[PDB]
């Protein structure tokens, strides 16, 4: 039945490809040709945030749209006030190879992790007043790429062992394990209703996962190289991916296929970080050619450029109210833009 | 109003405490020199770590070796916990002073794998400013392999027959000229990879080391000194 199983699997792939091509023939680009363009988007470095010794991979905005956390591989996790450029907190790390950081939506905890294969949860609100490590989550067999807080007791981590994992923080055990990627999973984004999360890996594929069901609903392909960054559209029915093939892509969940491609001939370096604005009309992407491009997400035009970093842009974040964009880089500086 | 004045000056003094702590951390960070140990299982890169530990603490997979050469601190990181794919986590080591590359030179079957790994490191976009300190380990096993016969280099490298010793550069580690020609052919393979690309930003520093060799820390010290001198000479001088 080996030939029958292979025939069934090939027929399954052909059937779902035909189902996608029959599901929709129109494009969002031809839908939005009547829509007026955004025009030039001018953003200025409203703040420069200095104090990291080494390069920065990750930042995460707090839900207050004022505080933020940044992780650098000098061994520091620094929590900054963006309005007044004051360093609220500076957490020294046991392992100096941190690659991700997440700030809990309540504001009480922060997370980090990296090549140590461990997610460290640091408690900010302590009676003694100085921050300790609350929990130490071990069990991944690769480096940790991305982590995001569902709430104060649930954490979801993507790792280099091709698996994602939902952990219950207080018991320190893997509640759920999400398997199915063949390459190293690099980024994940939570849905607005926190019931679903997408994850892109180094197999040029993105996967949508149900958090409670524990299995993968849908698989999205189209990229030609490793996917480095993924982010939901604010509605939650779509998401954008950035990958090493110098291309950004917009996929929809219900149509289960790619809606747009954001690329230009002169762009040859990969995308390291992506994010959406609050409306979803502007898609911001960080690149390895040392600057960021703001894209009109509805007609795929380069609306603006955020130059001002002397090295590659590793992280990029937009606030919940959408007021500012924070850009980190390998030149050890963050920049707040409006 | 008054309470927000209290809050903002408390925030400013907390920032000042953080900033003085970070400048102390900056001094400690600049004092040490970070190395990435890289290699394979057949190479004895864990052994050379053991000589610098004389001259498994790390439970996170990644190994840390702190060694002290003439009041200069070296922190060498051996990454072992990860998978075989290394595209993404090798980018964490762009600011490393030097990559330590350890090769088993007696084993000829995996020499081409080591050469390909060296080529990928040398031509990587984020590693093209990092000089490589190349250690050719188990040179005593290289000598017994070539003298006993039955394992010829010519089977794995067909251009060894058309190769001669460059100038008989340092005959004392390998007495017999067959051993010398073998080790210098391997060294020239790695350096013809090195000299093909890289616009003076980084250079290879080959060494011939045994298993029981005890001067590898001094070799790393001298090569790192040359690396920093070449970096300064490239920075503010065209020459």
């Amino acid at each position, epitope marked *: 039945e080996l030939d029958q199983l292979r025939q069934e699997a090939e027929q399954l792939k052909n059937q779902i490809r035909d189902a996608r091509k029959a599901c929709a023939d129109a494009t969002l680009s031809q839908i939005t040709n009547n829509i007026d363009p955004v025009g030039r988007i001018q953003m200025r470095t409203r703040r420069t945030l200095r104090g990291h010794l080494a390069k920065i991979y990750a930042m995460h905005w707090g839900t207050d749209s004022r505080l933020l956390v940044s992780a650098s591989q000098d061994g520091k996790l620094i929590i900054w006030d963006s309005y007044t450029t004051n360093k609220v907190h500076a957490i020294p790390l046991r392992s100096s190879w941190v690659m991700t950081c997440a700030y809990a939506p309540s504001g009480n905890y922060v997370a980090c992790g990296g090549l140590d294969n461990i997610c460290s949860i640091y408690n900010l609100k302590t009676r003694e007043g100085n921050v300790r490590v609350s929990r130490e989550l071990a069990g991944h067999t690769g480096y940790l790429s991305c982590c995001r807080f569902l709430d104060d007791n649930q954490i979801v981590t993507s790792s280099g062992d*091709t698996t994602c994992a939902l952990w219950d923080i207080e018991t320190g055990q893997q509640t759920t394990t999400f398997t199915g990627h*063949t*390459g190293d999973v690099m980024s994940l984004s939570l849905a607005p209703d926190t019931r679903l999360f997408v994850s892109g890996a*180094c*197999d*040029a594929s993105a996967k949508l996962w149900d958090v409670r069901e524990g299995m993968c609903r849908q698989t999205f*392909t189209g990229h*030609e*190289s*490793d996917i480095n960054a993924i982010c939901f559209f604010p509605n939650g029915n779509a998401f954008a991916t950035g990958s*090493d*093939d*110098a291309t950004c892509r917009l996929f929809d969940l219900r149509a289960d296929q790619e809606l747009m491609t954001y690329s230009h001939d002169n762009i*040859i370096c*990969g995308i390291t970080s992506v994010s959406f604005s609050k409306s979803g009309r502007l898609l911001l992407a960080g690149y390895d050619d040392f600057n960021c491009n703001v894209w009109d997400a509805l007609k795929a035009d380069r609306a603006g450029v955020l130059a001002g970093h002397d090295n590659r842009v590793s992280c990029l974040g937009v606030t919940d109210d959408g007021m500012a964009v924070a850009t980190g880089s390998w030149d050890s500086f963050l920049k707040i833009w409006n | 109003t008054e309470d927000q004045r209290n809050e903002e000056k408390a925030q400013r003094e907390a920032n000042k405490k953080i900033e003085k702590q970070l400048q102390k951390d900056k001094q400690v960070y600049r004092a040490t020199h970070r190395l990435l140990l890289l290699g394979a299982d057949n190479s004895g890169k864990s052994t050379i770590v053991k000589q610098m530990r004389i001259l498994s603490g790390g439970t996170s997979g990644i190994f840390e070796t702190k060694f002290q050469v003439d009041k200069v601190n070296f922190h060498m990181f051996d990454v072992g916990g990860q*998978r*075989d*794919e*290394r*595209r993404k986590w090798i980018q964490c080591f762009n600011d490393v002073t030097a990559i330590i590359f350890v090769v088993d030179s007696s084993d000829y079957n995996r020499l*081409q*794998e080591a050469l*390909n790994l060296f*080529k*990928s*490191i*040398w*031509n*990587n*976009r984020w590693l093209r400013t990092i000089s490589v300190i190349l250690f050719l380990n188990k040179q005593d096993l290289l000598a017994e392999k070539v003298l006993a016969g039955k394992s010829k280099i010519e*089977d*794995y*490298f*067909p251009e060894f027959a058309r190769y001669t010793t460059p100038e008989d550069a340092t005959p004392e580690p390998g007495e017999d000229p067959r051993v010398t020609r073998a080790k210098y052919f391997i060294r020239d393979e790695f350096l013809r990879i090195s000299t093909a*690309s890289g616009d003076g930003r980084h250079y290879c520093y080959p060494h011939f080391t045994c298993a029981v060799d005890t001067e590898n820390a001094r070799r790393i010290f001298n090569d790192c000194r040359d690396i920093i001198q070449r970096m300064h000479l490239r920075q503010y001088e065209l020459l």
Partner: nanobody
Amino acid sequence: QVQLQESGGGLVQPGGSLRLSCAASGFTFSNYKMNWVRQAPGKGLEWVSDISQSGASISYTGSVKGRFTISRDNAKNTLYLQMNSLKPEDTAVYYCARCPAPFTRDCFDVTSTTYAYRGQGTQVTV
């Protein structure tokens, strides 16, 4: 979908000649360096040959440069390996491997794990 499909293989008398063809779909062919890798029975994956984006830069392994001839058709999006004078050491499973990022001179293609940009493979017996 990034797909690589190998064709050609099978039994051959020693000293024979085969032409392995790798059809590539789901990516631009011209912008990636291509490799030929093989896995001997009861042995790990070892790299055999590589060819640059244009096809000018070409290199081979210890299996002699004269026996094997790598070539690429960027218009046809396909990768050829011409295998001459087969020896019994050449019995292996042969994979065409795209190396992961475009515009690069560095490639990491011989990982034992599920390296994504590698074909399902073809069997050459001799």
